[PDB]
């Protein structure tokens, strides 16, 4: 098992853990802020997903400082994880293209 694949696997696991902790910590940051919607666990999990993917519909979003901090970690984990998958696909294609060229 080559490095770029172990890392893509590791990244994906690590993102799922960030999604779960982020859901949990978002609700804990946002309860106590009047008007907040990010305040029950099921939809916080959906919110962490659509944040990690950078979709950001706008149905849900943090309004407190620490919910916004949790959001940033989730965004970075998500962009980084998907970028690491992209970089692993690059490595696979580049290796395959070496062989196909006899290099």
């Amino acid at each position: 098992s080559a490095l770029h694949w172990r890392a893509a696997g590791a990244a994906t696991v690590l993102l799922v853990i960030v999604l779960l902790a982020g859901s949990y910590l978002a609700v804990l940051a946002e309860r106590g802020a009047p008007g907040a919607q990010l305040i029950t666990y099921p939809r916080a999990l959906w919110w962490s997903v659509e944040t990690a993917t950078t979709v950001g519909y706008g149905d849900l979003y943090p309004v407190t400082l620490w919910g916004r901090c949790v959001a940033v970690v989730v965004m970075v984990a998500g962009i980084t994880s998907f970028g690491l998958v992209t970089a692993a696909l690059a490595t696979w294609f580049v290796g395959r293209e070496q062989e196909r060229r006899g290099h």
Partner: antibody
Amino acid sequence: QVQLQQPGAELVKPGASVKLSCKASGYTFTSDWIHWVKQRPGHGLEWIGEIIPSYGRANYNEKIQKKATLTADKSSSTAFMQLSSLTSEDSAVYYCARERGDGYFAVWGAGTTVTVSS
Amino acid sequence: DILLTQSPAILSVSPGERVSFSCRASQSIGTDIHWYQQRTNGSPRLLIKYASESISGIPSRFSGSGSGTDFTLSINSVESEDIANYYCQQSNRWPFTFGSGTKLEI
């Protein structure tokens, strides 16, 4: 099973304070919140506050004067509300309720009748 | 904070007739409304969650409908045990709030 257990009654002299208890049984999750709800005679339900025992974070109703203070004892599965400096306006039935972090109060205590008098 | 309006405060119906309780939210709250029954000297009891979802242990008689700002709790064929106060509660925005309640009278 009875999932939340509360004492039937507390009498409190005016200006004094009282700690209300709520011992939980059944399933307890890291995610569970314990809520407190006040009901004055002839009146409706009034949301007072909430605490998450696993992390110890608590929130309070702002719209009403803040006499309360919420703690939990993870070891005893018991949540406490300290109402301090009480008046006749604080005499009420105080319920505790359990919410699994999904927004509704699935189970309630029998409530503690708190009477302020001399 | 979200104000929940329950009106009328009292509802008089005849035995076995359909009855409908109204809950109105001061702004759209999706389907994040739950309904409680409180009998004389009792504590509240969850009847319906998320506007229309059945709770096991609760007679089929009870139903819920609505979304947005207008919500209804319905009893098809009232009977004496249904004599209680009925409260709605929203969990869409913090803090959770309750309606002022409606009494059923037969």
